[PDB]
Amino acid sequence: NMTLNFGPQHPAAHGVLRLVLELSGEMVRKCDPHIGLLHRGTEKLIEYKTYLQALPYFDRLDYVSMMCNEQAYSIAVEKLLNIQPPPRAQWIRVLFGEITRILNHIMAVTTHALDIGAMTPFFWMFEEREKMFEFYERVSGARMHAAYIRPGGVHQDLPLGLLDDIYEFSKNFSLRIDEVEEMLTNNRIWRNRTVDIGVVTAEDALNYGFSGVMLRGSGIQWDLRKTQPYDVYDQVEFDVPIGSRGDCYDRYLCRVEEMRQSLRIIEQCLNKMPPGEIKVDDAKVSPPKRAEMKTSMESLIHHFKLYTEGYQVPPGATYTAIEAPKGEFGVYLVSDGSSRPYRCKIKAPGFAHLAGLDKMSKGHMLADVVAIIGTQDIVFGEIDR
Amino acid sequence: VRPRSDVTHKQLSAFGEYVAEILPKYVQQVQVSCLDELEICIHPDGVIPTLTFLRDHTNAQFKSLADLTAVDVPTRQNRFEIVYNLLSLRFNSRIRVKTYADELTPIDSIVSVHIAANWYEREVWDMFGVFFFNHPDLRRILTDYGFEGHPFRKDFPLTGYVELRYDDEVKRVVAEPVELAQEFRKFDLNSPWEAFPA
Amino acid sequence: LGLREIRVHLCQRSPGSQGVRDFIVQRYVELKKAHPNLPILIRECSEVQPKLWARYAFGQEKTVSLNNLSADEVTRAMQNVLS
Amino acid sequence: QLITVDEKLDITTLTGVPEEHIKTRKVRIFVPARNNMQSGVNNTKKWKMEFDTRERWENPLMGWASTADPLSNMVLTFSAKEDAIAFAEKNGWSYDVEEKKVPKPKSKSYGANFSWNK
Amino acid sequence: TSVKPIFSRDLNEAKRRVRELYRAWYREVPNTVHLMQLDITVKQGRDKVREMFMKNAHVTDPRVVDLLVIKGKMELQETIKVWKQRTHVMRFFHETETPRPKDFLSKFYMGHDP
Amino acid sequence: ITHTGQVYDEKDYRRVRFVDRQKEVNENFAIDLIAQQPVNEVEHRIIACDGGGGALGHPKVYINLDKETKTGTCGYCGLQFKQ
Amino acid sequence: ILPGAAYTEKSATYVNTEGRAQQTKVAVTPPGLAREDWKIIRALSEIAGITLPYDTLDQVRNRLEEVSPNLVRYDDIEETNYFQQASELAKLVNQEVLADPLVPPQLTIKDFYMTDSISRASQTMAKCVKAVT
Amino acid sequence: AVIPHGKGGRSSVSGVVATVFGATGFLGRYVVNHLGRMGSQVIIPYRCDVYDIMHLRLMGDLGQLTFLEWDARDKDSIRKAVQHSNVVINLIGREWETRNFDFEDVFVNIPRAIAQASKEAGVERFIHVSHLNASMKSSSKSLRSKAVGEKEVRSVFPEAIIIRPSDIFGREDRFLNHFANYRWFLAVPLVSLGFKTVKQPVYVADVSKGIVNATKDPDAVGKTFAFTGPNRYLLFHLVKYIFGMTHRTFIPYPLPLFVYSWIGKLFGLSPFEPWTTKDKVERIHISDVMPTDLPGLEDLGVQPTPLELKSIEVLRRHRTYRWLSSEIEETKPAKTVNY
Numbered sequence A: 001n002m003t004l005n006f007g008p009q010h011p012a013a014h015g016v017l018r019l020v021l022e023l024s025g026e027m028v029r030k031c032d033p034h035i036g037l038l039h040r041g042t043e044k045l046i047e048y049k050t051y052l053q054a055l056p057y058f059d060r061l062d063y064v065s066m067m068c069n070e071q072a073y074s075i076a077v078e079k080l081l082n083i084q085p086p087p088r089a090q091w092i093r094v095l096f097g098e099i100t101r102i103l104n105h106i107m108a109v110t111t112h113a114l115d116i117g118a119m120t121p122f123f124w125m126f127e128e129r130e131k132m133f134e135f136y137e138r139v140s141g142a143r144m145h146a147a148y149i150r151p152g153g154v155h156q157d158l159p160l161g162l163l164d165d166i167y168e169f170s171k172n173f174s175l176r177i178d179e180v181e182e183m184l185t186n187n188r189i190w191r192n193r194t195v196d197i198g199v200v201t202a203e204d205a206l207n208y209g210f211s212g213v214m215l216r217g218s219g220i221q222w223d224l225r226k227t228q229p230y231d232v233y234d235q236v237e238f239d240v241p242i243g244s245r246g247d248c249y250d251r252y253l254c255r256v257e258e259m260r261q262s263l264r265i266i267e268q269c270l271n272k273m274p275p276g277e278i279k280v281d282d283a284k285v286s287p288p289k290r291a292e293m294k295t296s297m298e299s300l301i302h303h304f305k306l307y308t309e310g311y312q313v314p315p316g317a318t319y320t321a322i323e324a325p326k327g328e329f330g331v332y333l334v335s336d337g338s339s340r341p342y343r344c345k346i347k348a349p350g351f352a353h354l355a356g357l358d359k360m361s362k363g364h365m366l367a368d369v370v371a372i373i374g375t376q377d378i379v380f381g382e383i384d385r
Numbered sequence B: 001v002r003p004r005s006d007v008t009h010k011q012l013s014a015f016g017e018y019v020a021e022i023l024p025k026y027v028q029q030v031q032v033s034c035l036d037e038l039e040i041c042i043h044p045d046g047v048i049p050t051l052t053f054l055r056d057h058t059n060a061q062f063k064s065l066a067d068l069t070a071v072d073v074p075t076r077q078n079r080f081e082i083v084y085n086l087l088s089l090r091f092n093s094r095i096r097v098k099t100y101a102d103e104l105t106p107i108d109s110i111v112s113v114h115i116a117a118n119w120y121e122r123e124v125w126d127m128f129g130v131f132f133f134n135h136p137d138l139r140r141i142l143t144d145y146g147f148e149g150h151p152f153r154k155d156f157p158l159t160g161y162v163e164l165r166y167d168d169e170v171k172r173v174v175a176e177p178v179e180l181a182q183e184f185r186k187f188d189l190n191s192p193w194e195a196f197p198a
Numbered sequence C: 001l002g003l004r005e006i007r008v009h010l011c012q013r014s015p016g017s018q019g020v021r022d023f024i025v026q027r028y029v030e031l032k033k034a035h036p037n038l039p040i041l042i043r044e045c046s047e048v049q050p051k052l053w054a055r056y057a058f059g060q061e062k063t064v065s066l067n068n069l070s071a072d073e074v075t076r077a078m079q080n081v082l083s
Numbered sequence D: 001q002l003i004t005v006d007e008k009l010d011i012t013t014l015t016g017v018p019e020e021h022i023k024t025r026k027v028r029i030f031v032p033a034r035n036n037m038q039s040g041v042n043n044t045k046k047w048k049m050e051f052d053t054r055e056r057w058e059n060p061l062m063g064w065a066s067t068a069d070p071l072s073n074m075v076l077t078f079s080a081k082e083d084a085i086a087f088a089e090k091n092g093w094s095y096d097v098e099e100k101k102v103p104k105p106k107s108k109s110y111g112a113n114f115s116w117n118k
Numbered sequence E: 001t002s003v004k005p006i007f008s009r010d011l012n013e014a015k016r017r018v019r020e021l022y023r024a025w026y027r028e029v030p031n032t033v034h035l036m037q038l039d040i041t042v043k044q045g046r047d048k049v050r051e052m053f054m055k056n057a058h059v060t061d062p063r064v065v066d067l068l069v070i071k072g073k074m075e076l077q078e079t080i081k082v083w084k085q086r087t088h089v090m091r092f093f094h095e096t097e098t099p100r101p102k103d104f105l106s107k108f109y110m111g112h113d114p
Numbered sequence F: 001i002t003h004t005g006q007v008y009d010e011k012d013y014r015r016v017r018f019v020d021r022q023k024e025v026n027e028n029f030a031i032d033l034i035a036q037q038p039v040n041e042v043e044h045r046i047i048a049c050d051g052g053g054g055a056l057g058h059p060k061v062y063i064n065l066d067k068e069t070k071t072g073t074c075g076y077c078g079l080q081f082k083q
Numbered sequence G: 001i002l003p004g005a006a007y008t009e010k011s012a013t014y015v016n017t018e019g020r021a022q023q024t025k026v027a028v029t030p031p032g033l034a035r036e037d038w039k040i041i042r043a044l045s046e047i048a049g050i051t052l053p054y055d056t057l058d059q060v061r062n063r064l065e066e067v068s069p070n071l072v073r074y075d076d077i078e079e080t081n082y083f084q085q086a087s088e089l090a091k092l093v094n095q096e097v098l099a100d101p102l103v104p105p106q107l108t109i110k111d112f113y114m115t116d117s118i119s120r121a122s123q124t125m126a127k128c129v130k131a132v133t
Numbered sequence H: 001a002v003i004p005h006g007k008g009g010r011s012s013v014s015g016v017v018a019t020v021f022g023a024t025g026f027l028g029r030y031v032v033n034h035l036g037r038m039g040s041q042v043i044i045p046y047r048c049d050v051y052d053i054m055h056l057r058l059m060g061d062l063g064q065l066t067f068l069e070w071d072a073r074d075k076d077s078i079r080k081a082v083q084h085s086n087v088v089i090n091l092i093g094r095e096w097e098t099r100n101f102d103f104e105d106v107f108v109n110i111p112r113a114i115a116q117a118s119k120e121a122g123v124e125r126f127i128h129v130s131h132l133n134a135s136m137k138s139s140s141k142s143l144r145s146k147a148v149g150e151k152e153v154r155s156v157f158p159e160a161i162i163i164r165p166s167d168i169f170g171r172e173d174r175f176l177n178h179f180a181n182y183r184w185f186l187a188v189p190l191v192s193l194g195f196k197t198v199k200q201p202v203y204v205a206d207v208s209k210g211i212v213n214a215t216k217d218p219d220a221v222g223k224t225f226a227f228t229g230p231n232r233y234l235l236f237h238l239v240k241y242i243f244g245m246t247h248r249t250f251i252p253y254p255l256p257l258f259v260y261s262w263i264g265k266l267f268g269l270s271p272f273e274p275w276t277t278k279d280k281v282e283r284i285h286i287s288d289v290m291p292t293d294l295p296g297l298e299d300l301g302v303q304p305t306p307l308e309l310k311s312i313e314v315l316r317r318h319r320t321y322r323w324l325s326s327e328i329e330e331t332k333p334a335k336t337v338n339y
């Protein structure tokens, strides 16, 4: 088992992973993943920043699912304040929440293939991704790292015309997923490198805290979006894609199926989004509209205090978890009465998944390790935080 | 104003009593937040016993460990507040069991109860310095290989004490005491006026 | 031994200092009248036993403890200092 | 069974602080006063211990303030004087506690302002 | 007082562990200087080990000592199971940094706050 | 040179920075550009300067042009108005 | 010229009129090569061969304790005094109070604005002085 | 002046604005390193394309290192470089007389114009570097020409420090690498079979630190320091020692210099940086002069560093996989010669 220190060789990437390994020839005896190559301090930095100026950190925690992460902090800060977002904002967050899930799955399925060696699916779907980014940009201003979902709702209403385009795209994206399929779902070769690789039992998946497709792929039925509804994911109707014979191929099929189910949720959101405001009306939590702060004294005072000092969340602590595309993303946000948080442990679906690499890739070849890092959608930002 | 259902604050409250009764040797306080979240508090010795009862009890199956974290209240004699958040896919409820550990009074490890904790416990040692007995392999996970000091402790400087640059003379990366070119501006933000009785 | 200054660091309301303070009350004036230039410093320490610090010539300072000493012993010790 | 130690918990050896900043840094435990500008007293409640201030030289390229002292911006907040003193002792930093000074009671009554002879 | 023992009931038992670690490091110094192609002398390195093991000679409390070796053992593991490359090891020697004088006159001549 | 008379002394070395390079400055200086705009002769004691453009301008403020001698100047635009 | 610091720039001690010793804290590091007053004199001594025994502030303070009590105990007025023996020596002293009226130097407020060095060097104080004049 | 504020590392200020014309050099690289570490303002006049001076950028901090385009023949370029510097350090030198620059130019002609302007500018101090044992009559045109310069510059710039280093020992140096690279040559010629040319190497850093310390010390004015080393050596042990660490056979065979000066002439004809130089050859067999002079290292504040100590790093690249892991302890030391 000559340690090879593989992974600083940019072989599965997804970030920078020094997967020190001991391999008797081409068989892996033990995988000890090393982490922290991307630790940056996100958890300590937040303690020194106000709630609204810590929102941009969450987009960077796992930036392939830029927004879905923001929703988790939002929800958490809203709970602590016992404020809820307005009805239109909720639908928006579910609209962009799902668009983001697609974006993550297009990343996970196509990047999985690039490591496997199939390169054309990535270019096919990165063009669709591109088109989605443009939604982000025309809603937030940034292609990724938007900062659109803030603790009290969305920042600004959708541009006048976005919904129509999030339709044209959705109306077609399916065929794009269909194509990838005709290239990989039944490839006589995709199956081999993926089938029966990294099988994880159901009991073991719950035990190692997998909590994601990784659980769903093993047949455990748990979607925090159906079990513990957040926002208005309760008002929509979608089917969790549960899997059997959990293995790299089965979970994949699950990720392609949630891409499909998210188009079902996006359709609805476009069909039923309400007229209304996109941010709470409590100037206490949400910043006042710029026409108001420039004509009304109470609004300037509320604008000045909110931007300079902060929300001033009531003292308490909460663990709120959503179903980020990777898995359960949760923020444990302890908070003193101050405007700046006290602690904000980010639970990363990924710290648990990597740990499982050892119990998944046993008696496996070097190529198998590459396939399994792909089937965990490891974004080193969330793991390293 | 958020919608609150008291069904949960009642269900969870009752469970709290149930846990407390079943594990009275360790449960010190059991509270339900106004946010409908239970937070049994246990003596550090009850780490193994309280978790195991929750992982393997028919009326309370709490199979997966959502997270293991340690807030650091420097004022508190026992500095760290290890918090374990658990989920029950069977009863669709989460509970949090939180204990207290000082810097040199280690806590037991639950890698036995949940193997998810193998990594998070290493994370708590690296950042806060709490030690976990009976851990299979406790070693720094997130910090650099030669890092000295536990970073998330409230008493550790944000910028830290060492930074890295490449030195030609020695043709190798080299630590030097941190010298920052614009110190972190420490805006004082607390207002001198309170908000409510709380 | 050139004497430049004498510091009597008595400690008020302290049991031991009783003697020192008594000296101040009864004989301080006299000592000063006799040595009308020398600076005799009456200072008030705390949680410390009294000390008759003396500064001799060329920056040398010498110490004589006055803890629990009678009024005349304080007078005798002071007289021994300015020989 | 427990073991006995009379040694003041000093854990200076585990904290991981460079030697220079443990032996040359004096921290002051004080309850913050109120900027006279505002009359609110919610920032004069909890004790804080703050490390001694150090060099802040101007930066040549942009004129930004630059500091070589890591423990400068760090101010830890402790609820009671006893707990803050404990932090200094086990971390090995020197301490000089300042007693809280609270406004003395002041007698006020609107009638006085209309006094026959004030 | 009345503390719970971490791993060593008394400074005596604890010291036993320190002895073991010293030996460990002593036996390892040579290997590292060769597997990392470090430009140092085994003797030189071995003195460094001594330096560190004594930098913390003053600790009297058993619990503090026990953690110190746990931590010490962890460092060794990172250097014998090599995950710490030269840059990491040489840092111990503080080779690039300019030494600061501790003489008062020296400091006066250079820094506002000594 | 710059808006604030920022001119590196003849001996300062940051002038090396400008060696072989342009020290960026703007010809259009505000202190002067506002002066050009004439005083607005309003006929009401108190007038408001919304900043021009309403929401696209500056916070609305009312100016008292009562002082006959001087002219009101919006703390924001610098625009001056006289009665 | 051996430049020193100002009370905004050193952890020195001062005492007001009823002997309450108080501690200035360093708000800003002293400017230029300028140094804390106590060190310049400790250093000059080391360059002279009589070298003051104190090398760190805490030591200079311990020094203050041996020469005087108030200096080390802060915020603490010294209760007892010995007025009676003071009078006895006053009675021994014989002097003539000249008929010249005793006059405070600060007769009106322009007198007040500029007195010490920092005050004299004040542009704000100078503006205040001309406003009065 | 610039009051020195800071703790001492990068992002701190020391107040030394210094033009350094030949920084790209082996010695230079080191000079900019310390100057940058200390926090000094360093102006690096350069002629080679920007690609080659990138190695100097990370050294020093932002806005602390400024690079200026400069041509030796063009007097104006030197003029603007020293416009705002208060310290000028001259390291201009070469071993091969190039088509468009003669030993005079690189050593005496150019280094004069430079200090000349520096004075016009009003730079507080100028440090001029000339090779050790440089007689106005020494055999090698190089050494003699260098001697010629140290005189002239004194008239253009009085009280201008003149450090005079021996051949330098350091990674990327010639003294040590040259001999080690004789491997390609099956036999390693050594005049007088490498005898009677005792040599005292000096670590590059020591030289650099010394030079830097000069910039920040009033004691050195008109001083002609000589950084030498911690131990002398007959060229024989040096050559073998090198081959020793390189772990390559040592075959000392004597070669009559009269013929060897000719070999230097041969490579000298090379268009691309002749590897050996007629002027080199002589220099190599030019015995190191004795140490009776304004002391350099130690005198200027740095204790010399023995050759054997860091030799391992300089000669490692020349070993083969088989010996890469080998360490200094395994190898033997060379012997000094107080002679």
Ligand SMILES: NC(=O)C1=CN([C@@H]2O[C@H](COP(=O)(O)OP(=O)(O)OC[C@H]3O[C@@H](n4cnc5c(N)ncnc54)[C@H](OP(=O)(O)O)[C@@H]3O)[C@@H](O)[C@H]2O)C=CC1
Residues within 6 Å of the ligand: H021, H022, H023, H024, H025, H026, H027, H028, H046, H047, H048, H072, H090, H091, H092, H093, H094, H095, H101, H105, H106, H129, H130, H131, H132, H164, H165, H166, H167, H168, H173, H174, H175
């Ligand atoms: N063993 C040694 O290195 C010794 C060196 N010295 C002296 O120390 C000085 C530095 O030596 P070292 O660094 O090895 O020399 P290098 O060969 O490394 O060159 C030094 C610098 O001089 C510049 N230079 C050379 N010729 C010209 C020219 N015609 N016009 C403009 N610039 C020029 C080079 O710039 P570019 O490459 O861009 O042309 C280079 O950056 C030398 O002057 C030498 O006399 C003394 C004793 C021993």
Ligand SMILES: [Zn+2]
Residues within 6 Å of the ligand: F049, F050, F051, F074, F075, F076, F077, F078, F079
């Ligand atoms: Zn205006």
